[PDB]
Design a binder for this molecule. Structure first.
Ligand SMILES: [Mg+2]
Ligand SMILES: [Mg+2]
Lengths: 266, 49, 48, 350, 165, 63, 97, 40, 146, 54, 108, 142, 58, 157, 103
RNA sequence: CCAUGAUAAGGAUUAUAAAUUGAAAGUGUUAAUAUCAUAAUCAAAAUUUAUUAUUUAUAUUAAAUAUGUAUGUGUAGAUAAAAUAAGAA
């Protein structure tokens, strides 16, 4: 007498809060009190639901190549899959691996706000790709499988309000959220300014500004992903002094003010 | 409790489906955009002090 | 009539009805609105 | 130019309705409004101008700005006395009064029986018509799975229309306040009517012979080849090119040896560098921006590091990377970028 | 006929002057311009239709270029090409969607602020109200279907459904 | 090419109206001879329903 | 937009759309005002400077007026910058006469 | 300047050539007798 | 509403002029800088904020702030107008049946029963609530004044 | 499984079933706060008197 | 409610009584137009004129949406041709010298 | 549609014999994809340039468990013959297989080596009426 | 027409035969315009905004 | 899902949402894709600096890269299905069963105009219209005029 | 305000009254970027190269994208082993093995 | 998958002047009857369906991939369209 879609489900948040919390009545949606969302799905069920819902390229469909079934039936005729190792013999294998799915931050405005070339859209906001936890995008680890479930899936359960949410986004959404989720003032009162991976760049900018190449230094300034230290701006404006260029000095300082946390107020 | 909280909907029924009566007010063109301009009691206090 | 409600801004049959302004009337502004001037709301961002 | 034909700042407001008479009547309203706001502003500028004309001082700064030329039209540095400069100022202000009066007078023509706002002589601002936007939608009014013929015979033509009146105001000066009232007219705009703002104003631009110098063509020419597809992204920099304003003095040099090197007068070199009374070997100096011989960043001749007798690390040959990365003041990774041979053979440069 | 294009450097002339090709190159530096080297000189064709006051279709500009083989796949076509970003395709992308007000705001938000509550779609509401009215005469034409079966199949420790006839 | 009888008709009408503006009494003979008269005739508007786009309805077959 | 797209979520991207649709900045100047005494006493733009100017910028000249349309960037600020750059650059070359 | 122009409310700036609202529209819809003369 | 507040809108223009003239804005009485800062916070905004200032969330939150301080009166979504004004009767005809061509919401102080017709101060001496009939009404008005 | 308490019912036991969301005057959904901890006469059951408070 | 707007402000006229004079009423085979006025179309054109609507400059007319007919954009009011042109304009005209084409080419 | 040959038979109307704008018909079915040309052999239904690279589908793009059929636009390569591996294409009824390798295939698409409309007609998929009609056309014997 | 100096080139043909007997192809597939491709066909005329067709950028 | 508690009368309305993502995807991938093609197919020397063997190298490298993108949206626009945001009827764009400015099907268009919902104007069914350009040259000429005011009145810099 | 016939007896203002303009105007804020004041000069070197979040972004046609192109080249060449791209074949290269490649 | 509504096609006697040769009687998708099931295009695909104007002999495949078949005395039966800037009595 009981027909369900899934056999079992799980809770969003754990014992410490729940065991006490249950004593306070929560107001459920009046028309549809019982909520079963995609955050309530189990491991298997979620895996399956994230496979389906992407037309061809998506892992769920059988000929996408990510199919783990060893046999598939086309109209009463059973077909046995060809293993990839054998598929390689007549069809050369070119795989760059993960890194070819990610463009640098530079291109992001050209790409309309994305670093990610994957099948699903990837939002840099917390709430669209949110499962139980807030979504975070690994720029190293991106796979076709998408373990973290951060991508925007077209057909999955509960996708609708998310898709709407995406189409409702502000003009700078992608860019702004990428910028604020990373790059924030330290709990100490210390600037984010010092980061290992970007340091040689800042060294190059300063060293270039000191020999008086302003344009070169700026062309490298463009490539900077993180807030540059005060020394950078000191070097750039000090380079700006001899040739009398005022406008460029002012725009430098104006770039450091209120945009970048006032690194340039010094 | 608050008397200006007053039902914006008519009782749920088939009149909603079988009639061309719209479900919301149409946007008012000359209504400004609500934006935040103002201070707290706390802030006024701070300034005066 | 349907399960999809007429959006009253686009639909002339709403707009131009007897309960709103027809296009042959003189199209001016009905009443002024000072909202932000009367009562003003202080700024609290949801983000810190 | 005089009268109607000329102005300092021109605003065009493009009003768009769904119904013609809508936008027409709208144009009349907005027009009357800008007639009154217009009269107000232009009147005020007029009383200001009249005061200015009655008398006043001259800037030290304006005076200075008249006297800056190496040589004026009579072939010597010219002395404009404050009298003359005030005379120029006065001429232009007289012109401004002419134009103010023009506008104000036009504002006062359009009385109720006599109002005609299309002709630009009769009223300020005036109004041009703009051709209406008309899109014809053509489509099947039948739902039939059965026959093409029947779908075709059922075809309706309907249209979307959009109607445009354009409002022209030419003004003798630029007031921020006029712009404010004008951008504000979008808030009391009529029902279902929107608008555009076209502003055309006059603005001083500045051409430097410093940053965009006028030079002879290169003694090597540029072929068609420098122009292929993606030659824009590869073979060219974005102008202006970077010229050094800073230069190091070589050993046996004197003021005019350096000046003859940089392509400028001795005086100039002394003034850009005014801080220094003498220039020793190995000192950094300010190139006067009018110098002819100024150098471009990174001349086309590659700096080369020979192995040779090096540091005291050997006194024989240079070995490890970061040694040279210290010699040339760069990160080791750049040096590895440039030399593809010396990277692939080994790191000890065997 | 078929000839070799030729260029006389200004140093060679018995008066120096600026050659027109030189200027062409100056221009091509300034506004960056792809010089198409394989451009046949025999193919200059004004487009008769739109460029001659004689035809009713006259725009005064070269509307199309007349090359029969021109196609979207060619690299040059891609270099002068307009990108779909911020064109009408986008405006369609965002404002054409099944329930229009879901472009204006989150539905839950609007409802929760205006009414105290979230409201069903009208269709859902039809389903429901009919459920009520017809459960109140007949019964057991029905079926119990849900998202998750584990709630009905093991019910909690209390929960003794009222027997019915 | 505007050479064809319809365009010629138009041309005639044009010249005639001019002539009347220039020599007022000349308007009486012209009018009687039906020069000044304007005929209103048009090609039928284009339309998808017809085969050729103008006058010809599509083929009909008994069921 | 004062009408529909005025006040809700879509207001942002519509507004932005319109601003990026309008990013064109037109930059004009007559060639009569380019002929003036420069600060060194030379005439800034003379006959041959204008000939070289006119051949340099082809259709970018009409009715004795130079008009540069800068569309390159999404915003009007950067297009005034880009436009002024191309203008001073074009004058730089045309002055070679 | 002032938000509402002085030319609106100040009687020293009053415009004597202006007419009242009703007068013009009353004299506008007048259709005068078209038999002014005998014979035509 | 109080009109003259528009003059404060003049300020962010004047300020800009101060920059062009080289008058430092930081020499101003602390008093006036507070006053003017408040003026700015009234009318000035940037491109940045302006792209985002119509988010539905922000609008509805403003509505909510108004709800907690109990001023819902002027808001659009949050008011429901009830009372209709009836037509005027002509002695030229009772026979004529008038009907509505157009409808607009306007404040009641345009047409409301003249001070000498109505009972004395109604705010103080009479407690009046406009409310809905609970019963089904076959004809007449579904809102009555209690 | 399902019963008169879970099922959709217009009327349970000859009277209007309160368990149905759509059986209420929608005004009831409009938000309110808890009174009880505040003074006796602020409480909403005395509402008609509120204009008279002190 | 949101529907509180759409109540009837006044009482609608009842339908008390018979068909109006010369209404379409339909016997055995009768082709019937509710739309066409019975009396005034049957009137001969030579008397009434080809006119459907008052003869006035068409800027006062707008083609209605959803109705096939035209309306006055100032409802019910009319200005005669004499108020479009200047006082005493021959064949009411901007100016008396020439027609449209004449004005234009003279100007040229 | 009359008979539902797929999912879409429920959704779609035929609308008589109806004309579409040039080279746009909703459902691409290339009946002409194999259409013998001796002189045009390299230019017909193939790469508009000989200097182009093979399509995406001639290469393994990512880590694959494996596939059932390779797409029909994958060009036949010498390795397709030599390696002696399963080469499958999705055709109807089920799948076509390149079983009997030849060098005459090389450098064409299997879009070109697979006959879309077969002359072999099963009578088991036909209604009795349909079989009658095919007999009218002088296709099926009777 | 300007051309790259030192390149071997042809001049527009005066003799009809030279046109007709050359290897110049005819348009065969669908035709493409780099700008006009975005507003798709003549029959589908895509417009983002309803600006007057006459409208003049200032 | 599985037809339980469904909100919309027509399920396939959802497809419209999906369609939108398609277009969104293109915005993200378009520029990328096109560059990757242009650099790929280009025979002439790429530039003065990049020539010969370096050029072939880079070309193949780029096409290798473009290929490695999984999910990149390469599908030409005219191959996407147009669907009604209302009743989810579909049409082939460039035919009389789809209406371009409202972006709806013939069916919906009819339904929406006849009962007044969309505001349009009737015109004589057999003509060119009220409009001048279409009256002149037909579909093609108005098309051209569109090209002209979007592009050609600007002298680019 | 004093006019008691306003919408009721049929008087609808043809010109929107001064008071109302003053109010509508008083309600919305004025954008600061609309003031248009430049006394310095154009920033030739730095301005277009400024920090990536707030950057000047190219738009429309690909030419304008010059900077980005450079990056997309560099990046790609860095991530793409020639070992892999070796395998990508040209149509003629393949066809060389068909018994009759050339006619 | 049973589960009401609603717009097509279809020439047969209100005529010439300052003037329209396309109609309501309903053609898949739309709002109250529920009680078998996920069937939806994002490419490159399988002819049986009454309801469709194709290029007919000087020159003939280059860009999204684009049709290999039917020369047979303008030839059976039976069918199609039009009195509208055209020319019919
Ligand atoms: Mg689906
Ligand atoms: Mg029916």
């Amino acid at each position: 007498s009981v027909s369900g879609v899934f056999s079992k489900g799980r809770g969003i948040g754990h014992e410490a809060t729940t065991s006490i919390l249950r004593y306070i009545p929560r107001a459920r949606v009046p028309w549809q009190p019982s909520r079963f969302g995609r955050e309530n799905l189990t491991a298997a069920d979620m895996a399956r639901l994230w496979s389906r819902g992407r037309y061809r390229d998506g892992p769920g469909n059988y000929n996408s190549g990510y199919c783990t079934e060893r046999t598939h039936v086309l109209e009463e005729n059973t077909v046995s899959i060809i293993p990839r190792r054998e598929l390689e013999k007549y069809m050369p294998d070119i795989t760059i691996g993960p890194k070819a799915l990610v463009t640098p931050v530079s291109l992001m405005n050209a790409r309309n706000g994305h670093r990610v070339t994957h099948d699903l859209l990837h939002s840099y906001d917390p709430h669209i790709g949110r499962l139980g936890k807030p979504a975070v995008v690994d720029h190293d680890n991106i796979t076709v499988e998408d373990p973290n479930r951060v991508g925007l899936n077209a057909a999955t359960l509960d996708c609708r309000g998310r898709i709407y949410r995406w189409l409702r986004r502000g003009p700078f959404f992608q860019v702004d959220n990428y910028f604020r989720r990373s790059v924030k003032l330290n709990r100490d009162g210390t600037l984010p300014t010092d980061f290992v991976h970007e340091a040689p760049l800042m060294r190059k900018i300063i060293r270039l500004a000191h020999r008086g190449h302003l344009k070169a230094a700026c062309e490298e300034y463009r490539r900077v992903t993180t807030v540059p230290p005060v020394e950078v701006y000191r070097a750039l404006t000090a380079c700006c002094v001899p040739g009398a260029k005022l406008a460029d000095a002012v725009s430098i300082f104006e770039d450091g003010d209120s945009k970048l946390f006032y690194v340039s107020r010094d | 409790m608050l008397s200006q909280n007053v039902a914006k909907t008519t009782v749920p029924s088939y009149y909603m489906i079988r009639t061309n009566l719209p479900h919301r007010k149409p946007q008012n063109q000359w209504e400004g955009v609500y934006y935040y301009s103002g201070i707290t009691k706390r802030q006024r206090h701070l300034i005066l002090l | 009539v349907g399960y999809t409600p007429v959006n009253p801004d686009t639909s002339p049959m709403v707009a131009y009805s007897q309960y709103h302004w027809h296009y042959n009337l003189p199209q001016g502004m009905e009443r002024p609105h000072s909202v932000n001037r009367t009562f003003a709301a202080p700024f609290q961002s949801n983000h810190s | 130019e005089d009268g109607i034909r000329g102005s300092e700042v021109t605003y065009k407001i493009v009003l768009e309705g769904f119904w013609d008479h809508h936008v027409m009547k709208l144009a009349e309203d907005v027009c009357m409004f800008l007639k009154d706001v217009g009269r107000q502003i232009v009147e005020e500028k007029l009383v200001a101008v009249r005061r200015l004309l009655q008398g006043g001082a001259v800037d030290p700064e304006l005076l200075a700005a008249f006297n800056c030329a190496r040589a004026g039209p009579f072939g010597g540095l010219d002395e404009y006395d404050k009298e003359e400069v005030a005379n120029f100022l006065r001429s232009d202000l007289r012109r401004l009064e002419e134009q103010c009066l023009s506008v104000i007078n036009r504002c006062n023509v359009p009385v109720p029986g006599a109002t005609n706002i299309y002709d630009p002589h009769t009223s300020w601002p005036h109004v041009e018509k703009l051709e209406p936007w008309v899109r014809m939608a053509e489509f099947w009014t039948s739902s039939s799975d059965t026959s093409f013929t029947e779908l075709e015979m059922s075809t309706a033509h309907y249209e979307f229309r959009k109607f445009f009146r354009v409002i022209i105001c030419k003004l003798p000066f630029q007031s921020t306040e006029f712009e404010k009232r004008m951008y504000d007219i979008r808030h009391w705009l009529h029902r279902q009517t929107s608008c555009e703002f076209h502003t055309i104003y006059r603005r001083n631009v500045i051409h430097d012979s410093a940053v965009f110098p006028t030079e002879h063509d290169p003694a090597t020419p540029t072929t068609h080849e420098h122009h292929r597809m993606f030659s824009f992204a590869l073979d060219w920099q974005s102008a202006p090119v970077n010229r050094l304003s800073t230069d190091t003095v070589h050993e046996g040099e004197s003021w005019d040896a350096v000046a003859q090197r940089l392509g400028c007068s001795v005086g100039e070199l002394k003034d850009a560098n005014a801080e220094r009374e003498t220039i020793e070997a190995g000192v950094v100096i300010n190139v006067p921006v009018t110098a002819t011989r100024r150098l471009t960043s990174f001349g086309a001749t590659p700096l080369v590091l020979p192995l040779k007798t090096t540091s005291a690390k050997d006194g024989e040959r240079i070995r490890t990377w970061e040694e040279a990365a210290a010699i040339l003041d760069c990160t080791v990774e750049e040096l590895q970028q440039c030399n593809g041979h010396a990277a692939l053979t080994y790191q000890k440069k065997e | 006929g078929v000839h070799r294009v030729g260029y006389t450097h200004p140093s060679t002339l018995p008066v120096p002057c600026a050659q027109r090709w030189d200027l062409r190159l100056a221009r091509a530096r300034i506004f960056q311009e792809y010089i198409e080297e394989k451009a046949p000189g025999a193919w200059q064709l004004e487009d008769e239709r739109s460029m001659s006051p004689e035809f009713k279709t006259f725009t005064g500009y070269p509307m199309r270029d007349m090359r029969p083989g021109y196609g979207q796949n060619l690299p040059d076509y891609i270099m002068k090409k307009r990108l779909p970003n911020n064109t009408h395709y986008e405006l369609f992308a965002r404002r054409d969607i099944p329930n229009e007000d879901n472009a204006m705001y989150g539905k839950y938000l609007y409802d929760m602020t205006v009414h105290g509550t979230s409201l069903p779609s009208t269709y859902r509401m039809h389903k429901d109200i009919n459920k009520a009215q017809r459960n109140d005469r007949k019964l057991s034409g029905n079926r119990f279907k849900v998202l998750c079966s584990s709630g009905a199949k093991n019910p909690p420790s209390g929960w003794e459904p009222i027997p019915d006839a | 090419s505007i050479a064809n009888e319809i365009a010629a008709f138009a041309l005639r009408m044009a010249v005639a109206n001019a002539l009347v503006k220039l020599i007022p009494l000349t308007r009486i003979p012209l009018k009687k001879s039906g020069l000044l008269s304007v005929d209103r005739r048009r090609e039928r508007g284009q339309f998808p329903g017809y085969l050729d786009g103008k006058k010809v309805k599509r083929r009909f077959a008994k069921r | 937009d004062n009408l529909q797209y005025k006040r809700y979520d879509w207001q942002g991207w519509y507004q932005r759309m319109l601003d990026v649709h309008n990013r064109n900045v037109s930059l004009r100047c007559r060639i009569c005002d380019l002929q003036r005494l420069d600060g060194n006493g030379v005439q800034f733009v003379d006959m041959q400077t204008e000939r070289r100017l006119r051949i340099l910028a082809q259709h970018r000249v009409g009715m004795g007026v130079l008009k540069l349309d800068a569309d390159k960037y999404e915003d009007q600020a950067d297009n005034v910058t880009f436009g002024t750059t191309k203008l001073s650059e074009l004058l730089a070359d045309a002055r070679k006469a | 300047s002032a938000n509402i122009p002085r030319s609106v409310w100040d009687p020293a700036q009053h415009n004597p050539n202006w007419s009242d609202s009703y007068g013009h529209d009353i004299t506008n819809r007048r259709a005068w007798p078209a038999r002014k003369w005998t014979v035509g | 509403a109080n009109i003259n507040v528009v003059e404060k809108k003049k300020v962010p223009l004047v300020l800009a002029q101060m920059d062009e003239l080289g008058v430092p804005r930081t020499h101003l009485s602390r008093v006036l800088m507070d006053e003017v800062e408040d003026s700015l916070r009234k009318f000035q905004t940037y491109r940045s904020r302006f792209y985002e200032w119509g988010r539905a969330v922000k609008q509805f939150d403003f509505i909510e702030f108004r709800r907690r301080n109990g001023w819902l009166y002027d808001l659009h979504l949050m008011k429901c107008t009830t009372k209709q004004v009836g037509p005027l009767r002509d002695f030229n005809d009772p026979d004529a049946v008038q009907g509505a061509v157009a409808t607009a919401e306007i404040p009641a102080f345009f047409n409301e029963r003249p001070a000498w017709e109505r009972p004395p101060l109604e705010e103080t001496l009479y407690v009046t609530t406009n409310k809905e009939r609970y019963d089904d009404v076959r004809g007449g008005d579904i809102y009555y004044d209690d | 499984q399902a019963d008169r308490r879970t099922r959709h019912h217009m009327m349970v036991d000859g009277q209007i079933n309160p368990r149905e969301w759509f059986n209420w005057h929608p005004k009831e959904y409009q938000p309110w706060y808890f009174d009880r901890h505040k003074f006796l006469y602020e409480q909403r059951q005395y509402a008609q008197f509120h204009h008279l408070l002190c | 409610y949101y529907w509180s707007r759409y109540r009837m402000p006044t009482q609608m006229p009842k339908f008390d009584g018979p068909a109006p004079v010369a209404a379409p009423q339909s016997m055995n085979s009768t082709k019937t137009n509710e739309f066409i006025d019975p009396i005034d179309d049957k009137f001969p054109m030579s008397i009434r004129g080809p006119l459907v609507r008052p003869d006035v400059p068409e800027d006062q007319y707008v083609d209605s949406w959803y109705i096939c007919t035209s309306m006055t954009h100032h409802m019910g009011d009319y200005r005669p041709w004499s108020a479009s042109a200047p006082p005493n304009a021959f064949r009411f005209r901007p100016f008396n010298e020439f027609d449209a084409k004449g004005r234009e080419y003279v100007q040229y | 549609l009359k008979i539902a040959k797929s999912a879409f038979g429920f959704y779609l109307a035929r609308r008589g014999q109806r004309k579409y704008p040039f080279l746009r018909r909703p459902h691409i079915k290339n009946t002409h994809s194999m259409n013998p040309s001796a002189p045009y052999f390299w230019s017909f239904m193939t790469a508009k340039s000989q200097m182009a690279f093979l399509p995406e589908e001639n290469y393994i793009t990512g880590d694959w468990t494996g596939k059932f059929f390779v797409s029909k636009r994958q060009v036949y390569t010498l390795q397709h013959a030599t390696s002696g591996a399963k080469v499958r294409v999705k055709s109807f009824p089920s799948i076509f297989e390149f079983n009997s390798p030849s060098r005459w295939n090389i450098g064409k698409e299997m879009n070109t080596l697979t006959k879309p409309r077969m002359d072999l007609i099963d009578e088991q998929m036909l209604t009795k009426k349909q079989r009658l009609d095919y007999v009218r056309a002088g296709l099926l014997p009777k | 027409m300007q051309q790259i100096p030192g390149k071997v080139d042809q001049t527009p043909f005066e003799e009809d035969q030279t046109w007709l007997l050359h290897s110049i192809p005819v348009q065969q597939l669908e035709m493409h315009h780099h700008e006009k491709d975005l507003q798709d066909l003549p029959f589908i005329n895509h417009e983002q905004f309803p600006r007057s067709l006459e409208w003049n950028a200032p | 899902m599985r037809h339980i508690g469904q909100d919309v009368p027509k399920r396939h309305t959802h497809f419209v949402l999906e369609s939108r993502l398609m277009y969104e995807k293109s915005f993200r991938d378009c520029w990328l894709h096109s560059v990757c093609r242009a650099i790929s197919q280009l025979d002439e020397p790429l530039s003065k600096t990049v020539v010969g063997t370096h050029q072939k190298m880079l070309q193949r490298k780029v096409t290798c890269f473009q290929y490695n993108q999984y999910g990149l949206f390469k599908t030409p626009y005219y191959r996407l299905a147009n669907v009604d945001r209302y009743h989810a009827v579909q049409g082939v764009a460039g035919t009389r069963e789809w209406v371009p400015y409202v972006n709806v099907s013939y069916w919906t268009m009819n339904k929406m105009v006849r009962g007044g919902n969309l505001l349009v104007h009737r015109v004589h069914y057999t003509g060119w219209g009220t409009d001048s350009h279409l009256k002149k040259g037909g579909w093609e000429h108005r098309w051209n005029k569109v090209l002209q005011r979007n592009v050609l009145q600007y002298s680019r810099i | 305000s004093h006019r008691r016939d306003y919408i009721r007896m049929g008087y609808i203002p043809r010109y929107t009254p001064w008071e109302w303009i003053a109010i509508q105007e008083a309600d919305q804020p004025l954008i600061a970027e609309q003031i248009r004041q430049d006394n310095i000069g154009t920033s030739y070197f730095f301005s277009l190269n400024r920090y990536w979040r707030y950057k000047a972004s190219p738009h429309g046609y690909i030419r304008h994208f010059e900077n980005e192109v450079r990056d997309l080249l560099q990046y790609v060449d860095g991530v793409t082993p020639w070992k892999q791209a070796q395998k990508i074949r040209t149509y003629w290269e393949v066809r060389s093995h068909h018994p009759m490649p050339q006619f």
